[PDB]
Amino acid sequence: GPHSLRYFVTAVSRPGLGEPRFISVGYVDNTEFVRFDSDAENPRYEPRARWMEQEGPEYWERETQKAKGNEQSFRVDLRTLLGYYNQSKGGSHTIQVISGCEVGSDGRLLRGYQQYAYDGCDYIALNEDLKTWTAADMAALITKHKWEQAGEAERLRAYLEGTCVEWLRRYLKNGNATLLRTDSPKAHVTHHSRPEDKVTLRCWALGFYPADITLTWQLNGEELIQDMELVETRPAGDGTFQKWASVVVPLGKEQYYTCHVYHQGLPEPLTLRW
C-alpha cells in the first residue's frame, strides 16, 4: 500500500525564559523514527526507531547541522512575525510546519506538501501543483512575495520529488521488518450499567499495525454510526495501536447488537457480541 515521510516542526517563544523551544519530529507512516529537541542537554538529531541503527555517523552529523540551522532561522522568523502583525515582545507565539511526501505501493510519488501556521491558524502553503503558494492573510502575502523572488517553490519541489522520495524508499527498505509488517487486532467487548434501564457496550481493538482500522456497531444489519461514541486511533507505547467504540442500548437486548472490526490483518472482519 501507500507510504509517507512527514516532518512536524514547531518553534515556540517564551519571553523572559530564554530562547524559543524548537522541535522537529519525523515519521515514516504513523511511527516516529527521528527527532531533534532544543531543550536537550546537548541537542542532536536522534534515532527513535530501531532500524535507524543502519545509518552511519555521517547521517547523524548532517541532520544535526541542518536542525541547528533551522532552529536559528525559526528564532528569527518569530521576531519577523511580531513585526508583520504589530505584536509585542512580551507574549508567547507559535510557528508550526508539516512537510512531507507520499508514494504508492510502487514507490512513485503521489503527492507532496508543506504548510505553515502561526498561533494555530493557516499562514502559507504550497499548492498541489508544487509550483505556487496560497496565503491566508496579508502577512503571509509578504512571505509569498519573498519566496517568489528567491525561487523557493523550485527548491522545495526538487526536495519533495527527489530527496524526500528517495529517502522514504530507503527507510522502507531498511526497516522492512517493522514498517511492512501486519499485526492483527485482538478485540473484546465490555459491559457497563447505566440509569434508566440502559447499558453501555464498548468494543475494543488492541495491538494492531498499521494504524488504519474501522470499528462499527450494528443492529438489524444497519450501521449505528450516527449514535456511536469513540476515540481517535491511538499509539500504545510499543509501536502498535488501539481504539474503542461504544453505543448505549436498552437493558435486555444486548444480544441484538454486534461489533465489526475491519483491518488489513483480518482476512474476514471480526464480529463480536456481548
Binding site: 541542518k66 533551522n70 528569527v76 522545495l156
Partner: peptide, 8 residues
C-alpha cells in the same frame, strides 16, 4: 531526511 527551511 529533513529540509532546510526558508525564512518568512
Amino acid at each position: 531526511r529533513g529540509y532546510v527551511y526558508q525564512g518568512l
